[PDB]
Amino acid sequence: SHLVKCAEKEKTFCVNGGECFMVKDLPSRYLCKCPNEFTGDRCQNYVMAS
C-alpha cells in the first residue's frame, strides 16, 4: 500500500509489459512489476532456467 501508479508521461519507463509504480516517498523512486518471463529494473531482460 506504499505505491501508486505511474502518470501517463512516466508509464513508458517499464518495457516488456511490466506495470509501472512510483513510491509515495518524497526525490521519489520508480519500480515496476514484471511478467514471469522478464526481469531487470525496467523488465528489459528474460528470466532463465537451467
Binding site: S1, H2, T12, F13, V15, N16, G18, E19, V23, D25, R29, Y30, L31, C32, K33, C34, P35, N36, T39, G40, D41, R42, C43, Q44, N45, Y46, V47, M48, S50
Partner: protein
C-alpha cells in the same frame, strides 16, 4: 568457497509473490561470497529466510525494502565492500519494511557480525516496527565516520530497552545480541582495527572488520589482496630491484594478481601485463602469444582497430547495442568487451527518445574477428532469418561471462538457421540456445569441437524438433563431415571431407582437366602460377605454386624458373628455339643473338 553472482534490479520485482520468493532462493541459497548486490524486496510474512545465514561477504550494496517478514537472518554477514552504492550513496539501505494497513513488518536485524562497510554510507529509514537498529554506533562500522557523510539512521517507540550488561548499542532484546566495537575502542598508537582496548591487542593494517591476533594470517576479512591466507597491499612481482647493483633481478616467489587473489599462473584466455592478469590491454599496445602465453607489447605505426564493447570504456553506461551507439562500431575488428542485443536496442526505447535500429546499420559487425567477452542475443529484427552479419567472427574469448555463459540465444521465432561461418573457438564459458521454435541446424553441430577445456557444456532445451526438420529436408550438404554445419550451404560446414577451395567445400580440384589448373594437399586446393601451360589427356599440370613446379610454361625457361622475356633489361641474355634463356657476352644490353660479342649490335 561458494560464490554467487547476485542481482542488479534495484526495487523492481516479479508481479507474482510466489515466484519472487522462489527467485530469491535460486540466487542466494548455499553461497558465502555475493558478487554484485544482495537485495531483498517485497517478501511476504511467515516465509522461511534461514538460507540467507550462509552469506559472509557482499561486494556491492545490501538493499532491504518493502518486505513484510519479522526478522532479517544475515547472522554471519561480516563485511560489505560497497563497490557499487544504492542511489550512488548508500552501501546498506533498509526502508519501508511494514504494512500500514495492519501490524506486519521488520522488527529485528540479525546483523551482529557486521563490523565493516568500506565505501558509501548507511540508510535505515521509515521502518515502523524496528526496535534496536536506532541504538547502534554506526560510526564503528563505516570507513567514513561522520553524521553528514551519506548516512541517515531514523522506528516507533514502546519496544523494550537493551540488556543490562550493555551500554545501549545492541541488535536484540537480550544477552549475546550486543554490538562489538572494533575501531572506536583502540589505543591511540594503533592503525586500522583491534580486538581489545590495549595497544598489545591491535590488528595488522590490512585486516577488515575484526581479528584474533596481530598476524596478517589471523583475521576475519581482508582488504586489497589475499596471498594464500596472508592479507597484503600487493603480491611479490616477477622482478625485485637490487638496491646495491642498481638493476632489476628475477624473483623466485613471484605471483600474478587475479582480482582479489594471487595465483601462480593466469587463466588461458587472459593477457599478462606487469605481473598481473587483466581482461584487456591498453590501445597503444598489441596482444601477442609467445610460448602459449598471452602478453602485451607496443604496436607498430599501423596496428589493429581495438574497439569498446557494451559495459566498458566509452560505452560503460550502455546496456545494449542500439540506434545511438551502432555508428561507433563501423571499422572495428576486435571488441574489448561484451556484445549485447536487448529488446530496447532493436525495437527502440521511447522513454529515452531512442528510435528502433535500421536492420542495415547492423552490417557494421561484418568486419569483427574477435569478441573478448560474451555474445548475448535476446532480440533480432523480425525480417532477418539468420546471424550471417557475424560470418567473419572467429573467436569468442569468454573473459567476461553472463552467469557462466559465453554464447546466449533466447526466444527468437524469426530465425531458421544460425549461419556463422568463420567461428572456430569459444575459449571459455557455456553455450545456451533455447526457445527458437523455427531454428533447425542446431542439432547437427559437434559443439564439443569449439571448446578449449573439458569444463564447457551446451544447453539445448526447446528449439524446433530435429525429426520434423529432417522430414522437411532441413539438412546439410552431402560433402560435409560428421562434425556438422551452420546452415544448408557448401561453405557453411564446421569441417568437410575431400577438399576445399577457400571457404567452399568440393569433391575434387581438376588437376588434369577444366578451365583452371591448381595443386592440392591436406584437403586444401591452391591455384598454380598462371604462366604454366595447361596439361591435357589425363596429365597432371602442377605439383606446387612455383613456375619450377609445373610440366611446362609459355614463358621462357631460365634455369628451373620461367621468365616473360630474358632479353628485357639486365649481365644480358638471349633465348633459343626451345624457349630456354642463355647468357650473352657483356656490353650487349642493346641486343644480341647468341653466347658471344660477334652477334651483338
Amino acid at each position: 568457497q561458494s560464490v554467487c553472482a547476485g542481482t542488479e534490479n534495484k526495487l523492481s520485482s516479479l508481479s507474482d509473490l510466489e515466484q519472487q520468493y522462489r527467485a530469491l532462493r535460486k540466487y542466494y541459497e548455499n553461497c558465502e561470497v555475493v558478487m554484485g548486490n544482495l537485495e531483498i524486496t517485497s517478501i511476504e510474512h511467515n516465509r522461511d529466510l534461514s538460507f540467507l545465514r550462509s552469506v559472509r561477504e557482499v561486494t556491492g550494496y545490501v538493499l532491504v525494502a518493502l518486505n513484510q517478514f519479522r526478522y532479517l537472518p544475515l547472522e554471519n554477514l561480516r563485511i560489505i565492500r560497497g563497490t557499487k552504492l544504492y542511489e550512488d550513496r548508500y552501501a546498506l539501505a533498509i526502508f519501508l519494511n511494514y504494512r500500514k494497513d495492519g501490524n506486519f513488518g521488520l522488527q529485528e536485524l540479525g546483523l551482529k557480525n557486521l563490523t565493516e562497510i568500506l565505501n558509501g554510507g548507511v540508510y535505515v529509514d521509515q521502518n515502523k516496527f524496528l526496535c534496536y537498529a536506532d541504538t547502534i554506533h554506526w560510526q564503528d562500522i563505516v570507513r567514513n565516520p561522520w553524521p553528514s557523510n551519506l548516512t541517515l539512521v531514523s522506528g516507533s517507540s514502546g519496544c523494550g530497552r537493551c540488556h543490562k550488561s550493555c551500554t545501549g548499542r545492541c541488535w536484540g532484546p537480550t544477552e549475546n545480541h550486543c554490538q562489538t566495537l572494533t575501531r572506536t575502542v583502540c589505543a591511540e598508537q594503533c592503525d586500522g582495527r583491534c580486538y581489545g582496548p590495549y595497544v598489545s591487542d591491535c590488528c595488522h593494517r590490512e585486516c577488515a572488520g575484526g581479528c584474533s591476533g596481530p598476524k596478517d594470517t589471523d583475521c576475519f576479512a581482508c582488504m586489497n589482496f589475499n596471498d594464500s591466507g596472508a592479507c597484503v597491499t600487493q603480491c611479490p612481482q616477477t622482478f625485485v630491484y637490487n638496491p646495491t647493483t642498481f638493476q632489476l633481478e628475477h624473483n623466485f616467489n613471484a605471483k600474478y594478481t587475479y582480482g582479489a587473489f594471487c595465483v601462480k599462473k593466469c587463466p588461458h584466455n587472459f593477457v599478462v601485463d606487469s605481473s598481473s592478469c587483466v581482461r584487456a590491454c591498453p590501445s597503444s599496445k598489441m596482444e601477442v602469444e609467445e610460448n602459449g602465453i598471452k602478453m602485451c607489447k607496443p604496436c607498430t605505426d599501423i596496428c589493429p582497430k581495438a574497439c569498446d564493447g557494451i559495459g566498458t570504456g566509452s560505452l560503460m553506461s550502455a546496456q545494449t547495442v542500439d540506434s545511438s551507439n551502432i555508428d561507433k562500431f563501423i571499422n572495428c575488428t576486435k571488441i574489448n568487451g561484451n556484445l549485447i542485443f536487448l529488446v530496447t536496442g532493436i525495437h527502440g526505447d521511447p522513454y529515452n527518445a531512442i528510435e528502433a535500429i535500421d536492420p542495415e546499420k547492423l552490417n557494421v559487425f561484418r568486419t569483427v574477428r574477435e569478441i573478448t567477452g560474451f555474445l548475448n542475443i535476446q532480440s533480432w529484427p523480425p525480417n532477418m532469418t539468420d546471424f550471417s552479419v557475424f560470418s567473419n567472427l572467429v573467436t569468442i574469448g569468454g573473459r567476461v561471462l553472463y552467469s557462466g555463459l559465453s554464447l546466449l540465444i533466447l526466444k527468437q521465432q524469426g530465425i531458421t538457421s544460425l549461419q556463422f561461418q568463420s567461428l572456430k573457438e569459444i575459449s571459455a564459458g557455456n553455450i545456451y540456445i533455447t526457445d527458437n521454435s523455427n531454428l533447425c541446424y542446431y542439432h547437427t553441430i559437434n559443439w564439443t569441437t569449439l571448446f578449449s577445456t573439458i569444463n564447457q557444456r551446451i544447453v539445448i532445451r526447446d528449439n524446433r524438433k530435429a525429426e520434423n526438420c529432417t522430414a522437411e529436408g532441413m539438412v546439410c550438404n552431402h560433402l560435409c563431415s560428421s562434425d556438422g554445419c551452420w546452415g544448408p550451404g557448401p561453405d557453411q560446414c564446421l569441417s568437410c571431407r575431400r577438399f576445399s577451395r577457400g571457404r567452399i567445400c568440393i569433391e575434387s580440384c581438376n588437376l588434369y582437366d577444366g578451365e583452371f589448373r591448381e595443386f592440392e594437399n591436406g584437403s586444401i586446393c591452391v591455384e598454380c602460377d598462371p604462366q604454366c601451360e595447361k596439361m591435357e589427356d589425363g596429365l597432371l599440370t602442377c605439383h606446387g605454386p612455383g613456375p619450377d613446379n609445373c610440366t611446362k610454361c609459355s614463358h621462357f625457361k631460365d634455369g628451373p624458373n620461367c621468365v616473360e622475356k630474358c632479353p628485357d633489361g639486365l649481365i644480358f641474355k638471349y633465348a633459343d628455339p626451345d624457349r630456354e634463356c642463355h647468357p650473352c657476352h657483356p656490353n650487349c644490353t642493346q641486343g644480341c643473338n647468341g653466347p658471344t660479342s660477334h652477334d651483338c649490335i
